[PDB]
C-alpha cells in the first residue's frame, strides 16, 4: 500500500549549515517526505520526516518561490525550508504534500510556578527553569508561541504538565537535580570504562525505546543533553528549541556526518551520538575538535577517529564501530538497530532488563538529599 506520491529535485536549506542544496525528495502516502543526495535505488518509517499535521507556508523570503514545512514534533517546532524554480512547481509540491497530510487525518496555570532562570531562547519560544510552588520540585517549562502551532521511560525527561495561556503553549518537563553530565565529567576529567558502561547502557536502553517503540530519531545526543537524577541515573533531556543560527545553527562537534551533509539519515545518527558521548567519557576529550569550522567539518566527515593507548580493545571496538563515517557500516545501523550494540562484547554481562528496571546501582551518587535539594543549582558549588 505504501507508494510514492510525488518525487523530484528540490533545493533544501541546510539544517546546520544554512545553505541551499539540491536534494531528490520522495513524498509517499504514509506521510514520509525524505530527501537524498542522489535518486535512490530502493524500514518502519520515522516520524522525523512525516508531514502529518504540519503547516505549509509559501514565502518569497529569504528567497522567491520558497515553501516551508513546519511541524510540532513532541515538544519542538521544526521547520524544513525548500525552494523550487517556478511558482507552478511550488504549487505542485504544496498541494501534493497537503493532500498527503489530509489523507492521514483519518487546572495548572503559570501562577503555580516560580521563575528561576532562562535556560534557552529560540525562534518560536523560550525554555525557563521553574519550581512548582506547592512541592518545591524543579521543571523546565517550554513556552511556545501558540500561533506557529507522555509514555514514560526511566531515562528520558518526563513531560509532566501541559497547558496554554492566551497566546502560548506550555510544556512542563521534569528537571533532574543530580547535576549536568558535563559538570561531572569536567570535575572528574575522565570516567572509568565501568562508569561509562553504566551510563552508556542506560542511553542505549532509552534510544532503543525511542527507535523501536516511538519510531523517532533523537538526533541531539551530546553530553550537554545528559543529566543525572538524584540517584545517579541518566536523564536524556528534551529542553531544546529551534534557533536561527549564528552568522550555522549551534555547534558542529557532535553532529553525525550524514546530518552535517543534509543527506538521508536514520536511527544510525543516534549511535554516532552515543559514540561521541562515550568517547568523551572514557578519553576525556571530544573525538574531533578544531577552532576552524571548515576544518571541523572535514574532521567529522573525513578524519579517522584516533584513540588513546589507554583504551581497552573492547572499548576501541565499540567506539570505532559507533563512529564509522558511513551509517550503513556503523554499529547499530543495520536492521537490528540497538541489539547490535547490546550484544557487543563491550556490554558483555549487562542484563538489559536490569538496566531498564534500575536494578544496577549507579557508580556515582550525586551529592543531594532529595529531589528538591538545590546543590547543583547553588552558584557557590557549581564553581
Ligand atoms: C541550532 C538550533 C536548531 O534549530 N537545531 C535544529 C534544526 C532542525 C531540526 N529538526 C529536528 O527535528 N530537530 C531537533 C533535533 C533533536 N530532537 C530532539 C528530540 C527528539 C525526540 C524527542 C521525543 N520524541 C517523542 C517522545 C515520545 O515520548 N513520544 C510518545 C519522547 C521524546 C523524548 C526524547 C528524549 C527525552 C524526552 C523525550 C524529544 C527531543 C528535536 C528536533 C532540529 C534542530
Coordinates of C-alpha atoms and ligand atoms in Angstrom, one line a residue:
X1 CA 0.0 0.0 0.0
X2 CA 2.9 2.5 0.8
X3 CA 3.6 4.3 -2.5
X4 CA 5.4 7.3 -3.8
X5 CA 3.0 10.2 -4.4
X6 CA 5.5 12.8 -5.8
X7 CA 9.2 12.8 -6.3
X8 CA 11.7 15.1 -7.9
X9 CA 14.5 17.6 -7.3
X10 CA 14.2 20.4 -4.7
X11 CA 16.6 22.9 -3.2
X12 CA 16.6 22.4 0.6
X13 CA 18.1 24.8 3.1
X14 CA 20.6 23.0 5.2
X15 CA 19.7 22.3 8.8
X16 CA 23.0 23.2 10.4
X17 CA 25.0 24.9 7.7
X18 CA 22.1 27.1 6.3
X19 CA 23.0 26.9 2.6
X20 CA 20.9 25.8 -0.3
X21 CA 21.5 22.3 -1.6
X22 CA 19.9 20.1 -4.3
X23 CA 18.3 17.0 -2.9
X24 CA 16.0 14.5 -4.6
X25 CA 12.9 14.1 -2.4
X26 CA 10.3 11.4 -2.2
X27 CA 6.8 12.1 -0.9
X28 CA 5.0 8.9 0.0
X29 CA 1.4 8.2 1.0
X30 CA 2.3 7.1 4.5
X31 CA 3.4 10.8 5.1
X32 CA 7.2 10.4 4.8
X33 CA 8.9 13.2 2.9
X34 CA 12.6 12.3 2.6
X35 CA 15.5 13.8 0.6
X36 CA 18.6 12.1 -0.9
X37 CA 21.8 13.4 -2.4
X38 CA 21.1 11.2 -5.4
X39 CA 17.9 9.5 -6.7
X40 CA 17.7 6.3 -4.7
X41 CA 17.7 2.7 -5.9
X42 CA 15.2 1.4 -3.2
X43 CA 12.1 0.1 7.4
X44 CA 9.4 1.2 9.8
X45 CA 9.0 4.9 8.9
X46 CA 10.5 7.6 11.2
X47 CA 8.3 10.4 12.5
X48 CA 11.1 12.9 11.9
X49 CA 10.2 13.0 8.2
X50 CA 6.4 12.8 8.5
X51 CA 4.4 15.7 7.1
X52 CA 1.4 14.6 9.1
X53 CA -0.2 17.6 11.0
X54 CA 2.3 20.0 9.5
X55 CA 1.5 23.5 8.2
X56 CA 2.7 24.6 4.7
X57 CA 3.7 28.2 4.2
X58 CA 4.7 29.8 0.9
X59 CA 7.1 32.7 1.1
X60 CA 9.1 35.0 -1.1
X61 CA 11.8 35.5 1.6
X62 CA 14.7 35.0 2.1
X63 CA 14.3 33.7 -1.4
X64 CA 11.4 33.8 -4.0
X65 CA 9.4 30.6 -4.5
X66 CA 10.2 29.2 -1.1
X67 CA 8.0 26.9 0.9
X68 CA 8.3 25.8 4.5
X69 CA 7.0 22.6 6.2
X70 CA 6.5 23.4 9.9
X71 CA 5.6 20.7 12.4
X72 CA 5.3 20.3 16.1
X73 CA 7.3 17.1 16.9
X74 CA 6.7 16.1 20.6
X75 CA 7.6 19.5 22.2
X76 CA 9.8 21.0 19.5
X77 CA 8.7 23.1 16.5
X78 CA 10.7 22.0 13.5
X79 CA 10.9 23.7 10.1
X80 CA 12.1 22.4 6.7
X81 CA 12.7 25.0 4.1
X82 CA 12.6 24.3 0.3
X83 CA 13.0 26.2 -2.9
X84 CA 12.0 25.3 -6.5
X85 CA 12.4 27.1 -9.8
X86 CA 8.8 28.1 -10.6
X87 CA 5.7 29.1 -8.6
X88 CA 3.9 26.4 -10.6
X89 CA 6.3 23.8 -9.3
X90 CA 5.9 25.1 -5.7
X91 CA 2.1 24.8 -6.1
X92 CA 2.5 21.2 -7.3
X93 CA 4.6 20.3 -4.3
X94 CA 2.5 22.1 -1.7
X95 CA -0.8 20.7 -2.8
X96 CA 0.7 17.2 -3.0
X97 CA 2.1 17.5 0.5
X98 CA -1.1 18.9 1.8
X99 CA -3.2 16.1 0.2
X100 CA -0.9 13.5 1.8
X101 CA -1.3 15.2 5.2
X102 CA -5.1 15.4 4.9
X103 CA -5.2 11.7 3.9
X104 CA -3.5 10.9 7.2
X105 CA -6.2 12.6 9.3
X106 CA -8.4 9.5 9.4
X107 CA -6.2 23.1 36.1
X108 CA -2.5 24.1 36.2
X109 CA -1.5 27.7 35.4
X110 CA 1.6 29.9 35.3
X111 CA 0.7 31.1 38.8
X112 CA 1.6 27.7 40.2
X113 CA 5.3 28.1 39.2
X114 CA 8.2 30.3 40.4
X115 CA 10.5 31.6 37.7
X116 CA 14.2 30.9 38.4
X117 CA 16.3 31.2 35.2
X118 CA 16.1 31.5 31.5
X119 CA 17.5 28.3 30.0
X120 CA 17.2 29.0 26.3
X121 CA 15.6 31.2 23.8
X122 CA 14.5 30.1 20.3
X123 CA 12.7 31.4 17.3
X124 CA 9.2 30.2 18.5
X125 CA 9.6 30.4 22.2
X126 CA 11.8 30.0 25.3
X127 CA 12.7 27.5 28.0
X128 CA 12.7 28.5 31.6
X129 CA 13.7 26.8 34.8
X130 CA 10.8 26.9 37.3
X131 CA 9.9 25.5 40.7
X132 CA 6.4 24.2 41.3
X133 CA 5.5 26.3 44.4
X134 CA 3.4 23.6 46.1
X135 CA 6.2 20.9 46.0
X136 CA 9.5 22.7 45.5
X137 CA 10.3 20.5 42.6
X138 CA 12.2 21.8 39.5
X139 CA 10.9 21.8 35.9
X140 CA 12.0 23.0 32.6
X141 CA 9.0 24.9 31.1
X142 CA 9.0 25.2 27.3
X143 CA 6.9 28.3 26.4
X144 CA 6.0 28.3 22.7
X145 CA 4.1 30.8 20.5
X146 CA 0.6 29.3 20.1
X147 CA 0.2 30.7 16.5
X148 CA 3.1 28.7 15.0
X149 CA 1.3 25.6 16.1
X150 CA 3.8 11.1 27.8
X151 CA 4.9 7.5 27.6
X152 CA 7.4 7.1 30.4
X153 CA 10.9 5.7 30.1
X154 CA 13.2 5.8 33.2
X155 CA 16.0 7.6 31.3
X156 CA 14.0 10.2 29.4
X157 CA 12.9 13.6 31.0
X158 CA 9.2 13.2 31.5
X159 CA 6.6 15.7 30.3
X160 CA 4.6 16.4 33.5
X161 CA 2.1 19.1 32.6
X162 CA 0.9 20.9 29.6
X163 CA -1.3 23.9 29.4
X164 CA -1.9 27.0 27.4
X165 CA -2.2 30.7 28.1
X166 CA -3.9 33.2 25.8
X167 CA -1.0 33.2 23.3
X168 CA 1.4 30.5 24.5
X169 CA 1.5 26.7 24.7
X170 CA 3.5 25.5 27.7
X171 CA 5.2 22.1 28.2
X172 CA 6.4 21.4 31.7
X173 CA 9.2 18.8 31.9
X174 CA 10.9 17.2 34.9
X175 CA 14.3 18.8 35.6
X176 CA 16.9 16.4 37.0
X177 CA 18.6 17.8 40.1
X178 CA 21.7 15.4 40.1
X179 CA 23.8 17.8 38.0
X180 CA 24.9 18.1 34.4
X181 CA 27.0 15.3 32.9
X182 CA 29.4 18.0 31.5
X183 CA 29.9 19.2 35.1
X184 CA 30.6 15.8 36.5
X185 CA 32.9 14.8 33.6
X186 CA 34.9 18.0 33.8
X187 CA 35.2 17.7 37.6
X188 CA 36.5 14.1 37.3
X189 CA 38.4 14.6 34.0
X190 CA 37.5 11.1 32.8
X191 CA 35.3 8.2 33.7
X192 CA 36.4 4.6 34.1
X193 CA 35.3 2.1 31.4
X194 CA 32.9 0.7 34.1
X195 CA 31.3 4.0 34.8
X196 CA 30.9 4.8 31.1
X197 CA 29.4 1.4 30.5
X198 CA 26.8 2.1 33.1
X199 CA 25.8 5.4 31.6
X200 CA 26.1 4.0 28.0
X201 CA 23.8 1.1 28.8
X202 CA 21.1 3.5 30.1
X203 CA 21.4 5.6 27.0
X204 CA 21.2 2.6 24.8
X205 CA 18.0 1.5 26.6
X206 CA 16.4 4.9 26.1
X207 CA 17.4 5.0 22.4
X208 CA 16.1 1.5 21.8
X209 CA 12.7 2.7 23.2
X210 CA 12.7 5.8 21.1
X211 CA 13.7 4.0 17.9
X212 CA 11.6 0.8 18.3
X213 CA 8.5 1.9 20.3
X214 CA 8.2 5.6 19.3
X215 CA 9.8 5.4 15.8
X216 CA 11.8 8.6 16.3
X217 CA 15.5 9.6 16.0
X218 CA 16.6 11.7 18.9
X219 CA 19.4 13.4 16.7
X220 CA 20.6 15.6 19.6
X221 CA 22.6 13.1 21.6
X222 CA 25.5 15.1 23.1
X223 CA 27.0 15.4 26.6
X224 CA 25.1 18.7 27.2
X225 CA 21.8 16.8 26.9
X226 CA 22.6 14.3 29.6
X227 CA 21.9 14.9 33.3
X228 CA 21.9 12.7 36.4
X229 CA 18.8 12.4 38.6
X230 CA 19.1 12.5 42.4
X231 CA 20.1 8.8 42.5
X232 CA 22.7 9.0 39.8
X233 CA 20.8 7.5 36.8
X234 CA 20.9 9.2 33.4
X235 CA 18.2 11.5 32.1
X236 CA 18.3 12.4 28.4
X237 CA 16.8 15.9 28.2
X238 CA 14.1 17.5 26.0
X239 CA 14.8 21.2 26.6
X240 CA 15.7 22.3 23.0
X241 CA 14.2 24.8 20.7
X242 CA 14.9 25.6 17.1
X243 CA 17.1 28.7 16.6
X244 CA 18.1 30.7 13.7
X245 CA 21.8 30.0 13.7
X246 CA 24.6 32.5 14.3
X247 CA 26.3 34.2 11.3
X248 CA 25.4 27.9 11.2
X249 CA 23.0 26.5 13.8
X250 CA 24.7 25.8 17.1
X251 CA 27.9 23.9 17.3
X252 CA 29.1 21.1 15.0
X253 CA 31.3 18.8 17.1
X254 CA 28.6 16.3 17.9
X255 CA 26.7 16.0 14.5
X256 CA 26.7 12.8 12.6
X257 CA 28.3 13.1 9.1
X258 CA 25.1 12.4 7.2
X259 CA 23.3 15.1 9.2
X260 CA 26.0 17.6 8.6
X261 CA 25.6 16.8 4.9
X262 CA 21.8 17.2 4.8
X263 CA 21.8 13.7 3.5
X264 CA 19.3 11.0 4.2
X265 CA 19.6 9.8 7.8
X266 CA 18.0 7.3 10.2
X267 CA 18.4 5.6 13.5
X268 CA 22.2 5.3 13.0
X269 CA 22.5 9.1 13.8
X270 CA 21.9 8.3 17.5
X271 CA 24.6 5.6 17.6
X272 CA 27.0 8.2 16.3
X273 CA 25.9 10.4 19.1
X274 CA 26.4 7.5 21.6
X275 CA 29.9 7.1 20.2
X276 CA 30.7 10.8 20.7
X277 CA 29.4 10.8 24.3
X278 CA 31.1 7.5 25.3
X279 CA 34.4 8.6 23.6
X280 CA 34.5 11.7 25.7
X281 CA 33.5 9.9 28.9
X282 CA 36.4 7.4 28.5
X283 CA 39.0 9.6 26.7
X284 CA 38.3 12.9 28.5
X285 CA 38.3 14.8 25.2
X286 CA 35.9 15.2 22.3
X287 CA 36.7 13.0 19.3
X288 CA 37.0 15.8 16.7
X289 CA 37.9 19.4 17.7
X290 CA 39.2 22.5 15.9
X291 CA 38.6 26.2 16.1
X292 CA 38.1 26.4 12.4
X293 CA 34.6 25.3 11.3
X294 CA 35.8 24.4 7.8
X295 CA 38.5 22.2 9.5
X296 CA 36.0 20.8 11.9
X297 CA 33.5 19.8 9.2
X298 CA 36.3 18.0 7.4
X299 CA 37.4 16.4 10.6
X300 CA 33.9 15.0 11.1
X301 CA 33.4 13.9 7.5
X302 CA 36.9 12.6 6.7
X303 CA 39.4 12.2 9.6
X304 CA 39.8 8.7 11.1
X305 CA 38.9 8.6 14.8
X306 CA 42.1 8.1 16.9
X307 CA 42.2 6.6 20.3
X308 CA 44.5 6.8 23.4
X309 CA 46.8 4.0 24.2
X310 CA 44.8 3.9 27.5
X311 CA 41.7 2.4 25.9
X312 CA 41.0 -1.3 26.1
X313 CA 40.3 -3.4 23.0
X314 CA 36.6 -3.8 23.8
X315 CA 36.1 -0.1 24.2
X316 CA 38.1 0.7 21.0
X317 CA 35.9 -1.8 19.1
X318 CA 32.7 -0.2 20.4
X319 CA 33.8 3.3 19.7
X320 CA 35.3 2.6 16.2
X321 CA 32.0 0.8 15.3
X322 CA 29.8 3.7 16.7
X323 CA 31.9 6.3 14.9
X324 CA 32.1 4.8 11.4
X325 CA 31.5 7.6 8.9
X326 CA 29.1 5.6 6.7
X327 CA 25.9 5.0 8.7
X328 CA 25.4 1.7 6.7
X329 CA 28.6 0.4 8.2
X330 CA 28.1 1.9 11.6
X331 CA 27.4 -0.3 14.7
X332 CA 23.7 -0.2 15.2
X333 CA 23.0 0.9 11.7
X334 CA 21.5 -2.4 10.5
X335 CA 18.0 -3.7 10.9
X336 CA 18.7 -5.0 14.4
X337 CA 19.4 -1.4 15.5
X338 CA 20.1 -1.2 19.2
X339 CA 20.5 -5.0 19.6
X340 CA 23.8 -4.7 17.6
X341 CA 25.1 -2.6 20.5
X342 CA 23.5 -4.6 23.3
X343 CA 25.3 -7.7 22.0
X344 CA 28.7 -6.0 21.6
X345 CA 31.4 -7.5 23.8
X346 CA 31.9 -4.1 25.5
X347 CA 28.5 -4.7 27.1
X348 CA 29.1 -8.4 28.0
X349 CA 27.4 -9.3 31.2
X350 CA 25.0 -6.4 31.2
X351 CA 21.5 -7.7 31.8
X352 CA 19.4 -5.4 29.7
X353 CA 16.2 -5.9 31.6
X354 CA 18.0 -4.9 34.8
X355 CA 19.2 -1.7 33.0
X356 CA 15.6 -0.7 32.3
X357 CA 14.5 -1.7 35.9
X358 CA 17.3 0.3 37.5
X359 CA 18.4 -2.8 39.4
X360 CA 22.1 -1.9 38.7
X361 CA 23.3 0.6 41.2
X362 CA 24.8 3.9 39.9
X363 CA 28.6 4.1 40.3
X364 CA 28.3 7.7 41.4
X365 CA 25.8 9.1 43.9
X366 CA 25.2 12.9 43.4
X367 CA 25.5 15.0 46.5
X368 CA 21.8 15.7 47.1
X369 CA 19.4 14.7 49.9
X370 CA 16.2 14.6 47.9
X371 CA 14.6 15.7 44.6
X372 CA 14.3 19.3 45.9
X373 CA 17.9 19.7 47.0
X374 CA 19.4 22.7 45.3
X375 CA 23.1 21.8 45.4
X376 CA 23.6 21.6 41.7
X377 CA 21.8 24.9 41.2
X378 CA 23.8 26.7 44.0
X379 CA 26.2 29.1 42.3
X380 CA 28.8 28.5 45.0
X381 CA 29.1 24.8 44.4
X382 CA 28.8 24.9 40.6
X383 CA 32.1 27.0 40.9
Ligands
LIG1 C1 20.8 25.0 16.0 C2 19.4 25.2 16.6 C3 18.3 24.4 15.8 O1 17.4 25.0 15.4 N1 18.6 23.0 15.5 C4 17.6 22.1 14.8 C5 17.3 22.3 13.4 C6 16.5 21.5 12.8 C7 15.9 20.4 13.4 N2 14.9 19.3 13.0 C8 14.7 18.5 14.1 O2 14.0 17.5 14.1 N3 15.4 19.0 15.2 C9 15.5 18.5 16.6 C10 16.6 17.5 16.8 C11 16.5 17.0 18.3 N4 15.2 16.5 18.7 C12 15.3 16.2 19.9 C13 14.1 15.2 20.4 C14 13.7 14.1 19.6 C15 12.7 13.3 20.1 C16 12.1 13.5 21.3 C17 11.0 12.7 21.8 N5 10.0 12.4 20.9 C18 9.0 11.7 21.2 C19 8.8 11.2 22.5 C20 7.6 10.4 23.0 O3 7.5 10.1 24.1 N6 6.6 10.0 22.1 C21 5.4 9.3 22.6 C22 9.8 11.4 23.5 C23 10.9 12.2 23.1 C24 11.9 12.5 24.2 C25 13.3 12.2 23.9 C26 14.2 12.5 24.9 C27 13.8 13.0 26.2 C28 12.4 13.2 26.4 C29 11.5 12.9 25.4 C30 12.5 14.7 22.1 C31 13.5 15.5 21.6 C32 14.2 17.5 18.4 C33 14.2 18.1 17.0 C34 16.2 20.2 14.8 C35 17.0 21.0 15.5

